[PDB]
């Protein structure tokens, strides 16, 4: 695993530094690495593929060393090295696709393919080169039990969920109370409603609350908070809880009163913010607790006072909502986000070669089903496959 990154690092540098006309002292230490790759790899033989429609290929290495005697590199020296690099870079593609496609349930952090088990001998350890990427540095710190961290831009921490809750209801569905929400990606939009507009509430104030637990602990997040849910603002018809009938929701929107956002960790309040919108921070949390309340306005112009009567026909329903959005955070387990394409490389290999459903991952690599039940057996497999997908992205985009 450490020597699979070390093969790809000095094939990336060999296509970049060994160019025509360059001075020899620019590449004097790469050629000592590239010649010492070849000496270790000669005489061995490998075999990749076999699962699904992934074809079986056999690999055999018998190459010669590079020359170490020029002052400026010429077109003979480049063209005799390109037909050696192009055989290794085809070998690393078929080892990385052989490993992203396999999985185990007992110990997923171990290598699973036949070729990567063979590269983990002490014979092949002399190919080891620097480990400077983000995923190979966190592969080594976490293997010694030291603290790691991945930096994300808009991480997919929330599974998709769109539902509601009725705290007061009747079969006519004309005097209701409760909340509605959408949790999707890295964004929460909750909105509380009350049809009577707190005409009989004590002190004309109705209290709402919405609690979102996370799956993993986030660290040093940057969060944007805005006092409107724009998705629950228009008239719509909504089905009932069991799909029997439908009910109508015609909102008018007040401002949210007495907003309190809390950031919990094992039930302890780490941060809190009271009527403070814009950008906020959250240093360590795993549970977000939103709290906001509706207050009936005590003074109303004649255009407003017609909307909220005392009797039963309520044609304009009051609505109070919020909107939360995580911009960037630092987690310790691997996730998906909006910047890098490591999830897209894993699913595209499995979909292309028609791979059967195994014992660990959900069918079709569904991210909503995978972050919902994000077991420690799935975490060790998901890190092992995102790390191999990161090695393949250096050579083959």
């Amino acid at each position: 695993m450490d020597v699979l990154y070390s093969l790809s690092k000095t094939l990336k540098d060999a296509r970049d530094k060994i160019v025509e006309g360059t001075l020899y002292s620019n590449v004097s230490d790469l050629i000592q690495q590239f010649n010492q790759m070849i000496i270790t790899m000669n005489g061995n033989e490998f075999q990749t593929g076999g699962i699904g429609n992934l074809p079986i290929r056999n690999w055999n290495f018998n190459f010669g060393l590079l020359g170490t005697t020029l002052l400026n590199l010429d077109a003979n020296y480049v063209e005799t090295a390109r037909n050696t690099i192009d055989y290794f870079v085809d070998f690393v593609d078929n080892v990385c696709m052989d490993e992203m496609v396999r999985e185990s349930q007992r110990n997923g952090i171990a290598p699973q393919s036949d070729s990567l088990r063979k590269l983990s001998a002490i014979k092949f350890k002399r190919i080891n080169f620097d480990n400077s990427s983000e995923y190979i540095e966190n592969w080594n710190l976490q293997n010694r039990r030291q603290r790691t961290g991945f930096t994300f831009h808009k991480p997919n921490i929330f599974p998709y969920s769109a539902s509601f809750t009725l705290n007061r209801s009747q079969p006519a569905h004309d005097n209701l109370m409760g909340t509605m929400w959408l949790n999707a990606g890295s964004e929460i939009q909750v909105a509380g409603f009350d049809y009577s507009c707190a005409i009989n509430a004590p002190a004309n104030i109705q209290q709402f609350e919405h609690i979102v637990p996370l799956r993993r602990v986030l660290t040093t997040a940057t969060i944007t908070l805005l006092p409107d849910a724009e998705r629950f603002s228009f008239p719509r018809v909504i089905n009932s809880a069991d799909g029997a009938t439908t009910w109508f929701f015609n909102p008018v929107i007040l401002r949210p009163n007495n907003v309190e956002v809390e950031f919990l960790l094992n039930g302890q309040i780490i941060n809190t913010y009271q009527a403070r919108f814009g950008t906020i921070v959250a240093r360590n949390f795993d549970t977000i607790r939103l709290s906001f309340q509706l207050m009936r306005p005590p003074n109303m112009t004649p255009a407003v006072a017609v909307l909220f009567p005392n009797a039963q026909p309520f044609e304009h329903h009051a609505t109070v909502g919020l909107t939360l959005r995580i911009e960037s955070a630092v987690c310790e387990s691997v996730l998906a986000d909006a910047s890098e394409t490591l999830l897209a490389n894993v699913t595209s290999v499995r979909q292309e070669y028609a791979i059967p459903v195994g014992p660990v991952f959900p069918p079709g690599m569904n991210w909503t089903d995978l972050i919902t039940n994000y077991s420690p057996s799935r975490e060790d497999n998901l890190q092992r496959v995102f790390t191999v997908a990161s090695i393949r992205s250096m050579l083959i985009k």
Partner: protein
């Protein structure tokens, strides 16, 4: 530079490795660069063999 080996035969062996046209570049370049460490205090020395 001023480098040493541990006795008289390991200097006769490593000289013949330096001469013949079969040894690789990382080994021939190395035996002109391997170093002893004297460390006069604590009385601990290190010599290649």
């Amino acid at each position: 530079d001023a480098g040493k080996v541990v006795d008289s035969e390991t200097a006769a062996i490593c000289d013949a490795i330096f001469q013949d046209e079969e040894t690789e570049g990382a080994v021939r370049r190395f035996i002109a660069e391997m170093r002893q460490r004297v460390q006069a205090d604590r009385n601990v020395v290190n010599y290649p063999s």
